[PDB]
Structure 1
Amino acid sequence: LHKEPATLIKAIDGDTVKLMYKGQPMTFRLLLVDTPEFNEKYGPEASAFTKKMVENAKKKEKEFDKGQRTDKYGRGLAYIYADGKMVNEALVRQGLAKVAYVYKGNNTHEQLLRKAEAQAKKEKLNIWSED
């Protein structure tokens, strides 16, 4: 896999972002993760985290995996990076996303994200909290 430039149009929520890809406005869905919807618990927090992490980065990048690059809803499927740090991983590490939607052939960073999730569980963060 390799990173390539991502052109941000706007934040959407914890696990989707609007990108300009080859001059087409597209919703991109973060691979291997699931954030709460905005109106669910930790939804506002995941939204805010993803929004700021991407907006504040001078270098915004995306990385396709080896399998499908769009889902059945026409959303792009990628890992997103903000100054070299993977958004998908950071969400999971902070307990604002679960590892989810793991499909063989688009699962290159699965182990990386499950490591992060186990630490978020150990720390009882957010999704994994007693709250």
Structure 2
Amino acid sequence: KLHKEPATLIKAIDGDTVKLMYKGQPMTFRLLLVDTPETKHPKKGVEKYGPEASAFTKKMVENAKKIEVEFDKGQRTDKYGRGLAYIYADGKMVNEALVRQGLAKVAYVYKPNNTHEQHLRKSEAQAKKEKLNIWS
């Protein structure tokens, strides 16, 4: 059973990356299972909907009373040392909110880090059918 743990915002970095204080340590978190357009893209740079995805994540975490992180059942960090997690702002999953708004796509999935995959894919299908943002 996945469980939530408290964390404290340090800084939002991009639509898909936030820095948190977790168990007393500053750590960079990559949001599991989603890909947002990025502002800091290794190759392209500032893609379309990038600033928008990044403002959405920022606002959502900055205006929360409580931030919680939820690790999945597989690896908890990636090769860059970033935490891999579902992030919740007052009970609401940020990863899902992005996809529901057409501001992220469901990423390529790697088992067993895929507990909320079907739920995200259902929100993605609704945002596509609603032709929101990325899907417009």
- Decide: shared fold, TM above 0.5: yes
Tell me, in whole angstroms, the C-alpha distance in 1 between the residues paired with 2:26 and 2:4. 19
| CA offset digits 1:34-60 (Å, max 9, x no partner) | 0001xx100010000000101111011
- 1:26: how far off? 1.5
Structure 2: 5+ residue stretches without partners: 39-46
Contact 2:15 2:54 in 1 (8 A): yes
RMSD: 0.8
Question: Could you say which residue in structure 2 is the equivalent of 1:23?
Answer: 24
Tell me, in whole angstroms, the C-alpha distance in 1 between the residues paired with 2:119 and 2:7. 22
Alignment length (residue pairs): 127
Q: Secondary structure at the match of 1:102?
A: coil
Tell me, in whole angstroms, the C-alpha distance in 1 between the residues paired with 2:24 and 2:91. 23
Structure 1: 5+ residue stretches without partners: none
Runs of 4+ in 1 over 4 A off after TM superposition: none
Tell me, in whole angstroms, the C-alpha distance in 1 between the residues paired with 2:92 and 2:67. 10
Question: Could you say which residue in structure 2 is the equivalent of 1:98?
Answer: 105
- 1:122: how far off? 0.1
Instruction: Among all aligned residue pairs of Structure 1 and Structure 2, give the percentage whose two residues are the same amino acid.
Output: 96
- 1:101: how far off? 3.2
Q: Aligned runs of 1:1-131 on 2, under 5 Å?
A: 1-37=2-38, 40-129=47-136
Tell me, in whole angstroms, the C-alpha distance in 2 between the residues paired with 1:101 and 1:85. 23
